[PDB]
Design a protein around this ligand. Structure first.
Ligand SMILES: CCOC(=O)CNC(=O)NCc1ccccc1
Ligand SMILES: [K+]
Ligand SMILES: [K+]
Length: 164
């Protein structure tokens, strides 16, 4: 089956809770596998100890720049970047998990969780999963963002991994 993975998140060292994600390996295997492995840390690098660096209320929460911590960086388990796999899944509502990019075929490690329907991203960002549990936790992260994207507390993925 599809992987089920988790992110345990804190704000200034205080736990907010767990976000559980399904990864749609049946539709985007290569994209789902990248994320899965960055959660477990099995390649020697990954999301543990990195931040949500760009959080815009009524839009999305963005994370995954584990090299530069600011939106410039990240890397995939394949190499620095990898192709757009396909655009079959759409940005249908809150809870969609999608790849951030710098244009076509520039996927690395950065990702976002939507807090609204972001359909203007369809055909431009590769959707690869969704939130199974913990949308309340995502709304807590969202509360610490601002319209500029800058966060008011440091929001850290303190642990992550695979449940099944
Ligand atoms: C809601 C999604 O917005 C984005 O993807 C906007 N673009 C980013 O923040 N891109 C930073 C980036 C993403 C992957 C590779 C290098 C840089
Ligand atoms: K806007
Ligand atoms: K772990």
């Amino acid at each position: 089956g599809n992987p089920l993975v988790y992110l345990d998140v804190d704000a200034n060292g205080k736990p907010l809770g767990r976000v559980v994600l399904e990864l749609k390996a049946d539709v985007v295997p290569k994209t789902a596998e990248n994320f899965r492995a960055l959660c477990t840390g099995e390649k020697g690098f990954g999301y543990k100890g990195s931040t949500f660096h760009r959080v815009i209320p009524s839009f999305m929460c963005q994370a995954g720049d584990f090299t530069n911590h600011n939106g410039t960086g990240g890397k995939s388990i394949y190499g620095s970047r990898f192709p757009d796999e396909n655009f079959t899944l759409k940005h249908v509502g809150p809870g969609v998990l999608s790849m951030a990019n710098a244009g076509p075929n520039t996927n690395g490690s950065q990702f976002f969780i939507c807090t609204i329907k972001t359909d203007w991203l369809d055909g431009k960002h590769v959707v690869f999963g969704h939130v199974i549990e913990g949308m309340d936790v995502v709304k807590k992260i969202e509360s610490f963002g601002s319209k500029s994207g800058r966060t008011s507390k440091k929001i850290v993925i303190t642990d992550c991994g695979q449940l099944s």
